[PDB]
Amino acid sequence: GAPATVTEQGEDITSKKDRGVLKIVKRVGNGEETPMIGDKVYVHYKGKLSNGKKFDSSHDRNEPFVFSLGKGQVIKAWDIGVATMKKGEICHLLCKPEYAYGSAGSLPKIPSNATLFFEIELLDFKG
Ligand SMILES: COc1ccc(CC[C@H]2OC(=O)[C@@H]3CCCCN3C(=O)[C@@H](C3CCCCC3)NC(=O)CNC(=O)COc3cccc2c3)cc1OC
């Protein structure tokens, strides 16, 4: 499925070139602008452990999820990954533990050393 395909074929979007954050575009967005560090960004998303059977369903898919890009308000993989998205884009994002919750995890739901998978839709952004 998409997690395996992203693992194998995804683009490495990290500065370190460690394949730690891997991306495949799902739905092509509009224009060429991407959000900038400090912009408010607004998304929809679904996430799971990368080997998980089903996406997590514990948030309201109506409501935009909002954060300030590049400020450490979300896991590192999201600060790197959302920065690459065009408005209206949907992408698949696979994130090794160093770009997610690392050795600590977030117990119980996120174990130690967990690789995560997301689908992210960028709705809008503003400076
Ligand atoms: C700078 O590093 C961090 C910054 C903030 C946190 C707290 C958790 C943070 O969640 C996330 O960053 C990611 C990406 C944005 C959507 C939520 N995230 C999740 O990991 C998912 C998780 C659910 C189970 C399957 C894997 C994906 N969490 C949720 O969907 C539910 N929890 C929340 O959304 C709580 O609210 C947050 C609001 C802002 C940032 C975070 C969480 C953790 C951090 O590092 C470990």
Residue numbers in the entry: 13 to 139
Task: Show me the paper's own sentences about this structure.
The glycine derivative 13 a had an affinity of 2.3 μm, which gradually increased with increasing substitution (13 b (d‐Ala): 1.0 μm, 13 c (Aib): 0.29 μm). As intended, the interactions of the pipecolate, the A‐ and B‐rings, as well as the cyclohexyl group with FKBP51 were completely conserved in comparison to previous FKBP51‐SAFit co‐crystal structures. This includes a displacement of F67, which is responsible for the strong selectivity vs. FKBP52 of SAFit‐like ligands. The rearrangement of the β3b strand is stabilized by an inward flip of H71, which partially replaces S70 and substitutes the former as a hydrogen bond donor for the backbone carbonyl of Y57. Intriguingly, H71 is replaced in FKBP12 and FKBP12.6 by an arginine (R40 in FKBP12/12.6 numbering), which can be expected to be less efficient in stabilizing the 13 a‐binding conformation, providing a molecular rationale for the discrimination vs. FKBP12/12.6 observed for the macrocycles. In this particular case, the macrocycles provide the scaffold for the proper positioning of the key carbonyl group that displaces Asp68, which was not possible in the linear analogs.
A typical example is the family of FK506‐binding proteins (FKBPs) that possess a highly conserved binding pocket but have diverged to perform diverse biological functions. The most advanced FKBP51 ligands are compounds of the SAFit class (Selective Antagonists of FKBP51 by induced fit), which bind to a transient binding pocket unavailable to FKBP52 and are up to 10 000‐fold selective for FKBP51 over FKBP52. During a macrocyclization pilot study, we observed that many of these macrocyclic analogs have unanticipated and unprecedented preference for FKBP51 over FKBP12 and FKBP12.6.
